Amino acid sequence: IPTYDIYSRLLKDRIIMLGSQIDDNVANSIVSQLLFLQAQDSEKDIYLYINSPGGSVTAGFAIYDTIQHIKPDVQTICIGMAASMGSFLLAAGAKGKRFALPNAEVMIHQPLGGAQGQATEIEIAANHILKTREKLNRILSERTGQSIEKIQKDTDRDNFLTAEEAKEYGLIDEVMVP
């Protein structure tokens, strides 16, 4: 990573890079960067670059809730791929300031998890992941304008969208053309 390291130099210009799988460590870093940028200037836009295969739903919600909490608009820009919780965060950007570059890929699908143990433990785990899916679908319905029923059907299996299809779907506002 060249030398500020290159990411620290971008952060000085209010650019945050989400460029990996989303886990608690990545979420903690991005939340810290968002809070720091709000403290530096509560009015100026923040730019969140997304190239992510997704990851932890709770880690993703740490990022999502921090975006909605802070005063500055957070622009989202998909470069490469936004999949799963990565496409959820792309859709979470400020209304009118969600972008993808023309060859970027967006993928939506239902959450993944696991359950092991007694029948009643499996029931608790199943109910939890089903409630988590309902929560994701409700918010994605609000952010995209698509019905909960449509989001449920469209996320049953891996669903790959082009940048233009993601715009038609309401996950982004514009394809950033060169």
Instruction: Just list the catalytic residues.
Output: 84, 109
Q: Is the CB of 62 or the CB of 141 nearer to a second copy?
A: 62
User: Two tokens at 47?
Assistant: 């730019």
Compute the least distance from the CB of residue 100 to a second copy, in Å: 9
Residue 1 near a second copy by CB under 8 A: yes
- Which is it for strands 174-175 and 15-18: parallel, antiparallel or unpaired? unpaired
Among 90, 93, 105, 143, contact with a second copy (rule: CB under 8 A) = 105
Cα–Cα distance between 49 and 74 in angstroms, integer? Answer: 10
Q: Give 170: exposed, middle or buried? Use CB within 10 Å, 0-12, 13-18, 19+.
A: middle
Q: Amino acid letter at 12? A: K
Q: Is the CB of 31 or the CB of 57 nearer to ligand UTC?
A: 31
Helix (H) or strand (E) holding 96: none
Among 14, 35, 140, 144, contact with a second copy (rule: CB under 8 A) = 35
8 Å CB contact between 176 and 100: yes
Our CA angle for 140, 113, 142, nearest 5°, is 5
Compute the least distance from the CB of residue 167 to ligand UTC, in Å: 16
Instruction: Number of residues interacting with a second copy: please give it, by CB under 8 A.
Output: 84
Residues that bind ligand UTC (CB under 6 A): 9-10, 13, 15, 31, 35-36, 39, 47, 49, 66, 69, 77, 79
Compute the least distance from the CB of residue 170 to a second copy, in Å: 20
Residue 59 near a second copy by CB under 8 A: yes
Compute the least distance from the CB of residue 31 to ligand UTC, in Å: 5
8 Å CB contact between 78 and 90: yes
